[PDB]
Amino acid sequence: NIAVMLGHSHDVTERELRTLWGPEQAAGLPLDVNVVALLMNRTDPKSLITHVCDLMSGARIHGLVFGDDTDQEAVAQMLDFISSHTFVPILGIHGGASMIMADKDPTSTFFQFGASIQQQATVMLKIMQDYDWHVFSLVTTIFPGYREFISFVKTTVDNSFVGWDMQNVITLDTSFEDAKTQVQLKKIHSSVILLYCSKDEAVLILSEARSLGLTGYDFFWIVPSLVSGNTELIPKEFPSGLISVSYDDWDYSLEARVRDGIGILTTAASSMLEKFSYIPEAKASCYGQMERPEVPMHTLHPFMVNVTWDGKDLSFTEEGYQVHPRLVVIVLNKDREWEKVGKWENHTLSLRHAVWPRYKSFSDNHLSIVTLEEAPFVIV
Amino acid sequence: DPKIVNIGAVLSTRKHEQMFREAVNQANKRHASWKIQLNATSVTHKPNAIQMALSVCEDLISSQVYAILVSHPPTPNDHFTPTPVSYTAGFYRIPVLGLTTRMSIYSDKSIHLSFLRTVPPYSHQSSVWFEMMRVYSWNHIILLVSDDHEGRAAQKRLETLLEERESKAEKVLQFDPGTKNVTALLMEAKELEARVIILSASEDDAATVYRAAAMLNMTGSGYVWLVGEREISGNALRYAPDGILGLQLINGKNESAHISDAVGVVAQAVHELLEKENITDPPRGCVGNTNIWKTGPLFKRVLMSSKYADGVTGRVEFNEDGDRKFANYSIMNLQRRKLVQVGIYNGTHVIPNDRKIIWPGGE
């Protein structure tokens, strides 16, 4: 059972070496299972459908741990559709099957382990309050999820007692030529700016804003993912020192992600056998469908939501939210690269910088007072 | 000399396919014929989903289409009609049009990023709820919802409208979809200070709520009802107290007028767009190509702003989210069965008829 599909568009570090060990390890859940693997090429709907259907000829009680490398957004949705009308739980790992989609049909079973936008906003609020900035604006543009983004930000701001100063909400949606953009840009005067746009929109907004002067030596931009790509492909007009958060790929390698997926599948099978003592199959046919109604026999839905592995726990919930994602915070480097400061491991940030390095924006009274405790003059 | 373009896509039945062909031929005779031809194809529905996906990918491959019509099949109560098609055409940026698919999931643009529709979804039903209650001197509102997507969208729209007028609802009592007991929720709702129960359920759930409220002695003597378009059709109409205001859409079950309006607006947009810079032909094959074409979003943007005036359904125009603006609902009220028309709503334009309104009870 359990088949994994790949094909090494970029990382050719695979071959038969990937199909090594897995469920054997020290796991005490043995049965008639294997670690069957498969390689492929660039994905098109016809080719992808045919390949997954062909794999359904033998993957009777199996699953797929497919991963991609491109940036085509519809890949996740097509995976969701296949998972829906096949009853085969699957997961997503790299790139295309890594951007979490908002809603899924209930009669579906797959859980990509990315991170929700709300989680990003929570981590960003945590880091902002950690540096005690509080006052900030929320300039944005028109793009899907902007409304829920704004509402969640507002509700999270209001539901605490630390006193954030909420002002200067800008939601320009009228191209970038009229006076509304100009007055909206001129109105803001704070030092903490939070943006949310889509790639070229963000770069155009920043290119307009630099000409106003809001890109001085005492300003911050905390853009949420969006303009991050999957590499050091920052646009040349991105000045420097852009604060961002993103999913981790350097402290987590695919060789371990595949192992974690295999372990999750095996643990789910062990739980099902411990609770149902029998796991059926669904290898009737991929094609020639619409021949049978629903059959809730051994649905994986209740057997995965609270599953750990080797002590480490990464149990999911409802949507593809993994409760404990390995988000990492990065900054733009002087040499146009991404740094690595702090890692969201626990609810604590665990940052590395005691003070901010004051990154040079484009290509003064704070001093160091020193004293020690003594007498009723300085008290520790 | 003409250049060939191949709009045209899935319909319900063969008669509908022939009607589509005659409609496109009608759309050719007007204006241009010496530059553009736009002959059309067709293909019918299938039960199996994956077979439909393969068929629509064949359709994309063999013709290099520029748009897609996705009218719903004759077997009802599935809401599946446009989803698989959409996903395939979502891979690229070729827009698709819906014909009778009134549901709220498609209104999203982060998940169905290439979808248009010439029908308004249920959130606008919430909007008309608010308009009527605002000009009816009834500002209390106690709304019921099924814990699903469409209920959440309706409640969000209603509350968002209510915020501008600076008012507030009373309760958002929600119930699990497809459940069997709702007695506790009605009992909890009984002891309040509201009389304008507003519910947006889905068919059988609404029927069982009707039955429970009938048993619990909630009908009549004040506590006036309101109900959405689908809450009074089907089995729900069997179990119903007198006085409901089952708001519903005028000329929405028809599809002839919709096919006409769609082909008209698409042809207008295409003739407007081929005056531009170098436009690339759309991708074909389905097996040798994996890239989106550049002129997709530009085509959708052009299509969005388009005012087809002389149509069978009025000045069809598109709200920026991809829905249809300025519909016309008929506020059908019930009295001794055989729902009788009582007024007409046309967008901040609610106007009753000369008939007589009776409330639950009969006072």
From Swiss-Prot, chain B:
Its encoding gene is what? GRIN1
Compartment(s): Cell membrane; Postsynaptic cell membrane; Postsynaptic density membrane; Synaptic cell membrane
Family the UniProt entry places it in: Belongs to the glutamate-gated ion channel (TC 1.A.10.1) family. NR1/GRIN1 subfamily.
Q: Can you name this protein?
A: Glutamate receptor ionotropic, NMDA 1
Q: Provide the function of this protein.
A: Component of N-methyl-D-aspartate (NMDA) receptors (NMDARs) that function as heterotetrameric, ligand-gated cation channels with high calcium permeability and voltage-dependent block by Mg(2+). NMDARs participate in synaptic plasticity for learning and memory formation by contributing to the long-term potentiation (LTP). Channel activation requires binding of the neurotransmitter L-glutamate to the GluN2 subunit, glycine or D-serine binding to the GluN1 subunit, plus membrane depolarization to eliminate channel inhibition by Mg(2+).
Section covered of the full-length record: 23 to 385 of 938
Q: What is the effect of changing R195W?
A: In NDHMSR; changed glutamate-gated calcium ion channel activity; increased inhibition by zinc
Subunit info here reads: Heterotetramer; the NMDAR subunits are modular and harbor tiered domains that function in concert to regulate opening and closing of the cation-selective ion channel pore. Forms heterotetrameric channels composed of two GluN1/zeta subunits (GRIN1), and two identical GluN2/epsilon subunits (GRIN2A, GRIN2B, GRIN2C or GRIN2D) or GluN3 subunits (GRIN3A or GRIN3B) (in vitro). Can also form heterotetrameric channels that contain at least two GluN1 subunits and at least two different GluN2 subunits (or a combination of one GluN2 and one GluN3 subunits) (in vitro).
Q: Which residues are glycosylated?
A: N39, N181, N217, N254, N278, N328, N346
Q: Which domain of life is it from?
A: Eukaryota
Associated condition reads: Neurodevelopmental disorder with or without hyperkinetic movements and seizures, autosomal dominant: An autosomal dominant neurodevelopmental disorder characterized by severe intellectual disability and developmental delay, absent speech, muscular hypotonia, dyskinesia, and hyperkinetic movements. Cortical blindness, cerebral atrophy, and seizures are present in some patients. Neurodevelopmental disorder with or without hyperkinetic movements and seizures, autosomal recessive: An autosomal recessive neurodevelopmental disorder characterized by severe intellectual disability and psychomotor developmental delay, involuntary and stereotypic movements, spasticity, and inability to walk without support. Intractable seizures manifest in some patients.
For side Extracellular, which residue ranges?
1-363
Q: What does the record's free text say on domains? A: A hydrophobic region that gives rise to the prediction of a transmembrane span does not cross the membrane, but is part of a discontinuously helical region that dips into the membrane and is probably part of the pore and of the selectivity filter. The extracellular N-terminal domain (NTD) is a site of allosteric regulation to modulate overall receptor function.
